[PDB]
């Protein structure tokens, strides 16, 4: 008779439409909560440095837990220890990049490599530029560009991040499931630096480019993507 | 059926309304506007009366046929693009026509037509150039203006009036419109000193002159 089946499938279509609408209001107010959280995280440390200076003391800030690592020297002639640590940091091509959270194992891993990388403490704007500009997802071990939120949600919904905003939130405020979030993101592929490197084969301290720029990776991401 | 209002969002920048979704809910007042709930003709024949069919089957089929296109969105046809000027071309401005058979001549811009093209008459009493369309880009626009706001160009002249037909003879309404527009352009430029000699004299580049260094 079909006058029941069409009504039922229209109810089903409308139901999943209302479901999608509720998910959109969800990730909207999650992004709002995150903006409130980043105002709080940015003003809290300024307020505490101010109270330390007005007491006359000092305030050593939180030693940073998130770095962005860019491969600076090329394939040819790598010492094999350094080649293996680069294969674990997923810097294979020249001028790739990867987020890395910091602990005692990871700092020694970066410092074995350190003539071949430039790694720094990225801003929230740097994490935004990298995720929206070049951020691709390793789905089914293929490299599908993160065009819409369903590509993030199907692969990391089990760790309760749905959209690109709580992806960026986990990576910036390094969360519990940072391992699988960062392993989800493909190794970033950046262009050659506009303007140019000052000197590749030396450390940043001695007027070069390799090594540990601390905050000054936020002047090099801006011109490498 | 009600008469449609204009948009209650003022455009802040393109694509962003100045009022949010809840404030626009309040301004549109949806809190009190909620709701809840051919092919055959029969023609007589003097027999019987035959059901004639419009839009019949095709008589022929080409032996293989191209498929349909994927359909995209922003690709509007030319008659409805948005049309832009430069900032330096306002009505009243003297232009330097750079490319036509009237190349190098100083003229008087009148109006942005409906199909993008500038309307030009450096009045043909002066430099022998009629009411002619001329493209925005192919023109150096110098900084010399006249007080053209108080003239009345004829309404009945557009791109469909200047569009080419198919020797070419000058029709009588062309020279009537020409006389009727330059007869109120040209006394307004005789009030400016040495301007009619300017519109006669042609732009050219000499030795030692360079367009990046010369301001006009």
């Amino acid at each position: 008779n079909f006058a029941e089946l069409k009504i039922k499938r229209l109810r089903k279509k409308f139901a999943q439409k209302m479901l999608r609408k509720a998910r959109r209001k969800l990730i909207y107010e999650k992004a709002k909560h995150y903006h409130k959280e980043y105002r709080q995280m940015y003003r809290t440390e300024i307020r505490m440095a101010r109270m330390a200076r007005k007491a006359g003391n000092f305030y050593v800030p939180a030693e940073p837990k998130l770095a962005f690592v860019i491969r600076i020297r090329g394939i040819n002639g790598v010492s094999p220890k350094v080649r293996k640590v680069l294969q674990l940091l997923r810097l294979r091509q020249i001028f790739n990049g990867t987020f890395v959270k910091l602990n005692k194992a990871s700092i020694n891993m970066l410092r074995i490599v350190e003539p071949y990388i430039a790694w720094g403490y990225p801003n929230l704007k740097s994490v935004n530029e990298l995720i929206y500009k070049r951020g691709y997802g390793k789905i089914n071990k293929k490299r599908i560009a993160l065009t819409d939120n369903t590509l993030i949600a199907r692969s990391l919904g089990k760790y309760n991040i749905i959209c690109m905003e709580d992806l960026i939130h986990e990576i910036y405020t390094v969360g519990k499931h940072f391992k699988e979030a960062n392993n989800f993101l493909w190794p970033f592929k950046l262009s050659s630096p506009r303007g140019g490197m000052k000197k590749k084969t030396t450390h940043f301290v001695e007027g070069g480019d390799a090594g540990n720029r601390e905050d000054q990776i936020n002047r090099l991401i801006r011109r490498m993507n | 059926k009600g008469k449609p209002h204009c948009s209650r969002n003022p455009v802040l920048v393109r694509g962003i309304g100045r009022y949010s979704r809840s404030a626009m809910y309040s301004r549109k007042a949806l809190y009190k506007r909620k709701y809840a709930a051919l092919a055959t003709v029969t023609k007589p024949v003097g027999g019987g009366t035959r059901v004639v069919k419009l839009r019949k089957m095709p008589r022929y089929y080409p032996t293989e046929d191209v498929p349909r296109k994927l359909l995209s969105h922003g690709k509007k046809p030319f008659s409805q693009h948005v049309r832009k000027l430069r900032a330096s071309i306002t009505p009243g401005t003297i232009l330097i026509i750079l490319t036509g058979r009237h190349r190098g001549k100083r003229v008087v811009f009148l109006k942005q037509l409906s199909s993008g093209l500038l309307l030009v008459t450096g009045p043909l009493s002066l430099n022998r150039v009629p009411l002619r369309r001329t493209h925005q880009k192919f023109v150096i626009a110098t900084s010399t203006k006249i007080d053209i706001s108080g003239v009345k160009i004829p309404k009945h002249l557009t791109d469909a009036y200047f569009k080419k037909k198919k020797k070419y003879e000058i029709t009588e309404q062309r020279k009537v419109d020409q006389k009727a527009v330059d007869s109120q352009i040209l006394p307004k430029i005789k009030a400016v000193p040495q301007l009619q000699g300017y519109l006669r004299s042609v732009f050219a580049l000499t030795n030692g002159v360079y367009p990046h260094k010369l301001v006009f």
């Binding site: 139901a15 209302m18 479901l19 509720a22 209001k25 969800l26 | 709701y35 809840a36």
Partner: peptide, 19 residues
């Protein structure tokens, strides 16, 4: 609300309330 099998009655209620 926004996760499916436990938000069915809430999305149903907002559907009955949208009218």
């Amino acid at each position: 609300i926004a996760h499916p099998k436990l938000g069915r009655r809430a999305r149903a209620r907002i559907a009955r309330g949208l009218r």
